Amino acid sequence: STGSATTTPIDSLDDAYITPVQIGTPAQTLNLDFDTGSSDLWVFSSETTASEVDGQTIYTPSKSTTAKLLSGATWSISYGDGSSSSGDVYTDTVSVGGLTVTGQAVESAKKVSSSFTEDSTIDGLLGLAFSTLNTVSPTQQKTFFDNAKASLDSPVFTADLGYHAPGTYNFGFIDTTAYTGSITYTAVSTKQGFWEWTSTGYAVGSGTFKSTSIDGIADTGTTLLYLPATVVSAYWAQVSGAKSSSSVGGYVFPCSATLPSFTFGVGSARIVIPGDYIDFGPISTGSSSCFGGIQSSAGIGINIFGDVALKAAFVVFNGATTPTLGFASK
Secondary structure, three states: OOEEEEEEEOOOOOOOEEEEEEEOOOOEEEEEEEEOOOOOEEEOEOOOOHHHOOOOOOEOHHHOOOOEEEEEEEEEEEOOOOOEEEEEEEEEEEEEOOEEEEEEEEEEEEEEOHHHHOOOOOOEEEEOOOHHHOOOEOOOOOOHHHHHHHHOOOOEEEEEOOOOOOEEEEEOOOOOOOOOOOOEEEEOEOOOOOOEEEEEEEEEOOOOOEEEEEEEEEOOOOOOEEEOHHHHHHHHOOOOOOEEEOOOOEEEEEOOOOOOOEEEEEOOEEEEEOHHHHEEEEOOOOOOEEEEOEEEOOOOOOEEEOHHHHOOOEEEEEOOOOOEEEEEOO
16 A cells, blocks of 8 residues: 655745645544654644633544544653643554555544644644653553554655745655656664664765764754754854854744755765755744754754755655665755
């Protein structure tokens, strides 16, 4: 089997991407944030504290003939950005782009933090990291991908995120029309539960490539590119007037700037992030200070190849017995 679904930016900045997901019988379609940095499929629901729902579409398990309470199971998750959610668990039928999993754990939110409430466009998350990170207790649950894997034509999924445009998540096949050149594969460590890999270096604009190992995670659920302070300083030094602002929470730059590109290495291959992908617009409405899309990972504890990086590539998440990651230009 295979599946193919379009993923759409939630706003004009590509702050996140939503993908329609069918849950239950008859189908209830929710728009979920596919997150290769976490491993829970959770949804706004009829159980979510009413004051914490503001415009989201909810899953109502009592209206699904295939929903079953997973008795005694609870979940609770906290994300890198400080947001959180928790609740109880159902199993139900879940379909993405025509690919169906029966008995998928659907984690129903009883509580969500303010950042989730305030984002009316995101109805929940669909985790695509390794199932070892799943938070369900006392019996850990599998991700949608882990459940689908054996049935797929090939044990892979791909992320093809657009810049200010829709893109695609495919399951079970590699669309050879969706990228240029070849796909370069690179080793993955699953030790921390992430799609963790080592970039071979970087360049800023038309500058020379610096060969240096940068360990980080491929994370579709993180908006920006978070890299070591040395790398980030070297980038922003090429933008007149750019500075790190403790009050804003990162590097800002004059909205009048033209940003240089940023290149990262994948083995001997190179992925080029155009400068415009690094512009996240005014820090507040009407400001001439703009927020940068490359930020320091210092104090996160890990480097994160988030959407800024991933949307410059066609990315293969290879879930073979020994997982690997592939990157192609597009």
